Amino acid sequence: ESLTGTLDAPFPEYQTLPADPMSVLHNWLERARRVGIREPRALALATADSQGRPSTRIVVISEISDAGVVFSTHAGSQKGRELLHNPWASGVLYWRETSQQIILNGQAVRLPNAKADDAWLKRPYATHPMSSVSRQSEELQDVQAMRNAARQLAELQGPLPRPEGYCVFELRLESLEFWGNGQERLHERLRYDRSDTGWNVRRLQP
């Protein structure tokens, strides 16, 4: 048996079926914060290429919005190029300590540059030199050249201008699943799908 979690993970929502899934997302994230889950917002984000072939990587959720979740990246990266052509994405959060997963499905929209400017400035300025010199996901020809270039920019010891491709995406949710380990291996799966008006909610078989 592979699951190692041992912390109590209350899931009254599996019984009560709240109409509004963002409240469940807020409840779970707040509890994760309060009990000290390690890196709860590390999202395994999937995008797909022009033929529907998926790719994955970790990104951090920086904000929970009314419509979904927000993250930052580089537009020229693989995920950025894939999202520009096909906005559909899915990500999964998994918390080993409580044996909980959260699956988040929807369409990711690039937010305005004013939003990216604010997000860039909110990052610690020590992150700016490498994020400026790097063209994320292109081939790296000379490690030492990139290192030396970033070191020269870092001399400023303060904020740099936002690089053109640094962007913020909002994943506007169309469906969500909250998964808990449950009792007697009857894993508790609470599934939401957007309706014309609000959400439909269902339990799924484990």
Ligand X SMILES: Cc1cc2nc3c(=O)[nH]c(=O)nc-3n(C[C@H](O)[C@H](O)[C@H](O)COP(=O)(O)O)c2cc1C
Q: Which one of residues 55, 65, 152, 200 is an interface residue with ligand X (CB under 6 A)?
A: 55
In this structure, which amino acid lies at residue 109?
A: V
85, two tokens: 């052509």
- Look at residue 150 and give the partner it binds from ligand X, its own copies, none, a contact being a CB closer than 5 to 8 Å depending on partner kind: its own copies
Interaction residues for ligand X, span 80-109 (CB under 6 A): 94, 99, 101
Exposed (0-12), middle (13-18) or buried (19+): which is 10, by Cβ within 10 Å? exposed
Work out the number of other CB atoms within 10 angstroms of the CB of residue 197: 5
Q: With CB under 6 A as the contact rule, which of the stretches 10-18, 26-34, 58-66, 138-146 interacts with ligand X?
A: 58-66
Tokens of 110: 């690039």
Q: Phi and psi for 129 in degrees, rounded to 5?
A: -60, -50
Part of the chain binding ligand X (CB under 6 A), chosen from 11-19, 77-85, 105-113, 151-159: 77-85
CB of 42 to ligand X, least distance (A): 5
Minimum distance, C-beta of residue 180 to ligand X, in the bound complex (Å): 9
- Spatial neighbors of 82 by CB under 8 A, at least 6 apart, are 47, 48, 49, 55
- Shortest reach from residue 197's CB to ligand X, in Å: 25
Residue 155 touching its own copies (CB under 8 A): no
Q: Which of 22, 37, 68, 71 binds ligand X (CB under 6 A)?
A: 71
197 part of the interface to its own copies, by CB under 8 A:
no
Restricting to residues 121-150, which ones interact with its own copies according to CB under 8 A? 124, 126-127, 129-131, 134-140, 143, 146-147, 150
46 binds its own copies per the rule CB under 8 A: yes
34 HSE (CA, 13 A, CB side): 9
Report the distance separating Cα 105 and Cα 173, nearest Å. 6
Which residues have CB under 8 Å from 8's CB, separation 6+? 98
Q: Does 160 bind its own copies (CB under 8 A)?
A: no
Binding annotation for substrate: 2, 74, 123, 131
